[PDB]
Write a protein that binds this ligand. Structure first.
Ligand SMILES: *CCC(=O)Nc1cnc(C)nc1
Length: 341
């Protein structure tokens, strides 16, 4: 079996000429030559498993969309007893939006096209009643021709708006700078509006190459958001019934709105109108994915007949959070069976 940086990376004879790329949310990621399809591919090693691995595999195997990364193949031992590592093989993409924004200024045309493809993929995900819940530049892959694919469904959930409410300062898992204000106030992140806020943050980041709300800890994230949107209105406060959340907001000094054209003096005006609508404080007033696609900023691309939806809503058969470790390993084994000879 092949080794990389002193660690086993056992992808069978189909995949050769490994090159170490880095670490991801799962572990070691390499590229390799696929001797069947005659292209280099990306392979990630997954090494007591995590429910996030099963979630990712089940979703990605069910989804089929141009702007969502697929799973091409899965490598594992032929039996549960021998199964230790699982390797997930995917299209090799030149880069991701995190790397690209650290080095490259985007033209307005690239911003527009990237945003289109993000929302086109998101339309499909939300049409399946799924929330990605960790949209951010590093989860947006790009090829040499700037085709964009959304990746990492490890924190995804089925939408559940009727059970979205929670108390003030409830802990949350998803990446801090991309969290909607309501996560810190009264929301579990079980509604589609959670993902639109992340997309808004990504749009702002494409406009300036800097994250718009770089909070350094949980409540600092909310104070960055309020420092630009300004104090919420009476009406938007009245929507927050929880007293600890409400009263926290009422305790703050008045903050003025920072106009988008002052933060982004080089931006297209239609881009800033759409940004405003995605970065709306009140999640009920926030624009939805289909409205966003229909916004004038995206008029060159918008074509709902070419923005497909999922054939059916997605469902987890069992509730993943209460499965023991043996049942989780057993389910991963079953979900990956279709790739065995
Ligand atoms: C979703 C994140 C991801 O898969 N990123 C990634 C990093 N490196 C390569 C080669 N492919 C994908």
């Amino acid at each position: 079996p092949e080794m990389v940086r002193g660690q086993v990376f056992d992808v069978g004879p189909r995949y050769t000429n490994l090159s170490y790329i880095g670490e991801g949310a799962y572990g070691m990621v390499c590229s390799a030559y696929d001797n069947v399809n005659k292209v280099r591919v990306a392979i990630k090693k997954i090494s007591t498993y995590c429910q996030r691995t099963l979630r990712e595999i089940k979703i990605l195997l069910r989804f089929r969309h141009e702007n969502i990364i697929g799973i091409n193949d899965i490598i594992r031992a032929p039996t549960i007893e021998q199964m230790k590592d699982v390797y997930i093989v995917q299209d090799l993409m030149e880069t991701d939006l995190y790397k690209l924004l650290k080095t490259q200024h985007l033209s307005n045309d690239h911003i527009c096209y990237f945003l289109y493809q993000i929302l086109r993929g998101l339309k499909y995900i939300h049409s399946a009643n799924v929330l990605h819940r960790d949209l951010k530049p590093s989860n947006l892959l790009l090829n040499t021709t700037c085709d964009l694919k959304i990746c990492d469904f490890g924190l995804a959930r089925v939408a559940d708006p009727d059970h979205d409410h929670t108390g003030f300062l409830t802990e949350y898992v998803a990446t801090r700078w991309y969290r909607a204000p309501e996560i810190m106030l009264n929301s579990k992140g079980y509604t589609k509006s959670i993902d639109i806020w992340s997309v808004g943050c990504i749009l702002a980041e494409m406009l300036s190459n800097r994250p718009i709300f770089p909070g350094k800890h949980y409540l600092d994230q909310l104070n960055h958001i309020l420092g630009i949107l300004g104090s919420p209105s009476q009406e938007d406060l009245n929507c927050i019934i929880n007293l600890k959340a409400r009263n926290y907001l009422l305790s703050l000094p008045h903050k003025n709105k920072v106009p988008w054209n002052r933060l982004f003096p080089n931006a297209d005006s239609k881009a800033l109108d759409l940004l405003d609508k995605m970065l709306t404080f009140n999640p009920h007033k926030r624009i939805e994915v289909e409205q966003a696609l229909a916004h004038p900023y995206l008029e060159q691309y918008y074509d709902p007949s070419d923005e497909p939806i999922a054939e059916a809503p997605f469902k987890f058969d069992m509730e993943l959070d209460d499965l023991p470790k043996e049942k989780l390993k057993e389910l991963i084994f079953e979900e990956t069976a279709r790739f065995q000879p």
